[PDB]
Structure formats: structure tokens, C-alpha cells
């Protein structure tokens, strides 16, 4: 079986990630009583370029048969939540759109889309906005995350 771990992710500004819809995630600060709403990811180690600073991963939602993916939509790299066949996932060789390059930078994590280099899993500085794929060089949007094991 493919090597995986159960974890939560919080952005640089400590916002939690929640399942706002059947195929959507949102980021917002969660008070001590609403913490349980945060999504638990099952992060798998897929095939690709091995490095202590950059490793290929797939981000699934624990026991939900949902994976994050990046696809081109109207010429724009777009983050999606896709339902998968429970009998075929997780697998070592994932379809290219599911692969993220996990980067360890300044005691934080960045998730670069493997097929869209320079595009990262991002959050808005504002509250309760969807999690998206961002390509901005360094400004308004957050691309840095902390990981907490489950």
C-alpha cells in the first residue's frame, strides 16, 4: 500500500480549511468550539522527483473518496475537488492532475501543482472564501501552510 499520513492544514494567518460544499473547500478562522469542522487530509507519497526540499504528493480527504486536483479551465489553472473510484484509490501512480510538489520553505509548507509550475494551493486574506490555485509572485494571497498530524 502507498505511503500516506492523516493531517490538517492551516494557512500562514492560522485560518482553517473546511468543506463548504460537496466539491468545495473554504478558509476561515475557527473558534475553539468550531475546530472539529476542519478537513482531515490523507496525504500520499506518489511517483516523481525526490528531494528533501520538494516531494510529489496527492491530497485526499480522509475516507471521503475526494482528491484535490488542478485542471485548465478557460485557460486558467484551477483547483478542484474530485470524487474518485473507492476501488482504485489511493494508488502509487496517480493521474498527473492530482500531483502536488510539496515544498518545505521557512518551517512552512507550499503545495505547487506538478503540471502548472509557479501555481500554488492558496487562500484569500479575507474570511470564508474558497481555497483556490494561485499564481501571484508575492502579494495579497497566502501560499504558506502549517501541517498538524491526526
Amino acid at each position, epitope marked *: 500500500p502507498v505511503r500516506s499520513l492523516n493531517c490538517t492544514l492551516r494557512d500562514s494567518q492560522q485560518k482553517s480549511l473546511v468543506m463548504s460544499g460537496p466539491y468545495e473547500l473554504k478558509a476561515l478562522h475557527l473558534q475553539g468550539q468550531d475546530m472539529e469542522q476542519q478537513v482531515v487530509f490523507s496525504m500520499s507519497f506518489v511517483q516523481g522527483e525526490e528531494s528533501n526540499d520538494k516531494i510529489p504528493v496527492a491530497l485526499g480527504l480522509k475516507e471521503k473518496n475526494l482528491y484535490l486536483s488542478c*485542471v485548465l479551465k478557460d485557460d486558467k489553472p484551477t483547483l478542484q475537488l*474530485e470524487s474518485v*473510484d473507492p476501488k482504485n484509490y489511493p494508488k502509487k501512480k496517480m*493521474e*498527473k492532475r492530482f500531483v502536488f510538489n510539496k515544498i518545505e520553505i521557512n518551517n512552512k509548507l507550499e503545495f505547487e501543482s506538478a*503540471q502548472f509550475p509557479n501555481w500554488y494551493i492558496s487562500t484569500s486574506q479575507a474570511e470564508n472564501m474558497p481555497v483556490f490555485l494561485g499564481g501571484t509572485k508575492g502579494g495579497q494571497d497566502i501560499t504558506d501552510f502549517t501541517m498538524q498530524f491526526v
Partner: antibody
Amino acid sequence: QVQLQESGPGLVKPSQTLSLTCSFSGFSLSTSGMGVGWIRQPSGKGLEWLAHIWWDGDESYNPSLKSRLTISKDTSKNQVSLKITSVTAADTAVYFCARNRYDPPWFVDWGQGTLVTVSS
Amino acid sequence: DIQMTQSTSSLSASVGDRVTITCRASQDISNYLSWYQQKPGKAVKLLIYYTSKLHSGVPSRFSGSGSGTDYTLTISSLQQEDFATYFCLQGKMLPWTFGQGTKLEIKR
């Protein structure tokens, strides 16, 4: 603009290895997201996906013949090769190469194809 | 493997007819479907991608629809040059699989 062209030996004996080449121009296979696939069509039958290779060398194969296939790229010659070992009369077909950018693949440009007959 | 099926193997239709070609996936393919046209003595051409997006250079009489498992390629007003075999392809899961193809003949 973009062109793909298949070449190969035309006639091969059963149990031999078949080597096919996809010569391409008008794009670089080292460009992020770029891919080249091989598809075949036996006489009177439909299209069958065989193999694929991404810009980063990640190979994909159809399990119905994965053990017999090898796909490779040469970005210095702008060529994608397909090697099929232990061929049989079931491998007689027109072989095509096609390109895409990103997953899921939309095969935007296809070659004219190369006919391979497997016979003694 | 996701099985792709095209219930019509061959049919004939008249110039001007609204032609419908169906493709059914064995499981949810999340609109990751594309349509290809194969003409005699010519390289296969992409017509429609991501269920409904028209490939650049393809006439507007070609359109695509569907979701989940059921998909349709429509030719609004059939032309004599539309004689070809049409194949659907799923990109949801490896191995990528094609429909068996639908050969469309022109009635005259």
C-alpha cells in the same frame, strides 16, 4: 505550426520486437504539461490507447499490454519511441502518435499513422 | 477500467439533419470527455474537449453536452463533408479508454 509523424518497419515477424518513432516539431516536449501518446487501430476496429509520456518522463501504459510496452523520449532529436516486444498478428494495426498539454489529455494534434503488419 | 460505449455502430443521415451521437461511461467521468473525428485518408481530428468546448478551427455546427456517465455529440445541420467515424475518450482514470466509434454515412 505543429506536426507529428510516425515511422516504423512496416512488416515484422511474430515474436520480434517492434520499434516505432514519433518525430515531432512545432513544440517542445520539455515544456511543462506537455505529453505525447501512442494509440493504435487494428483493421476494421476502433481506437485503442497504448502509452503516454509527460515532459517529466512519467510513463503511462495500457495494462492490457503494459508488460510488452516501453515508451521513451529524446528531446535532442524531438522523438518519442514506442517499443512493443513479442509481437503477434493481434498487433497488426495503424499506429498513431498524438500530443496534448495537461491532464486530463485532449489529443489536439495527431499524426497520419504508420501501418504495421505482423506476419511470417 | 472505465468502459466507454457508443450504442450506434453506424448510421446514415441526410444533409441538414440534426445528428446526435451518444457515449456512455461505466462510471462518473466528471465531464473529462473529448470527441474525435476520423475521415478516410486523413489524421484524426479533435472536435470537442471537456464535454462542450469546441477545438479552434472546428465548425460551430458541432457541439457537445452531458455529465456523469451520459454524453452527446451534436451536429446541428449535417454537411456532406461530415462523413466520418466519431469516437469519445474518457480522461477521468488511467487507462484512458475510447468508445468503439460511430460511423456516420451521408444519405443522398
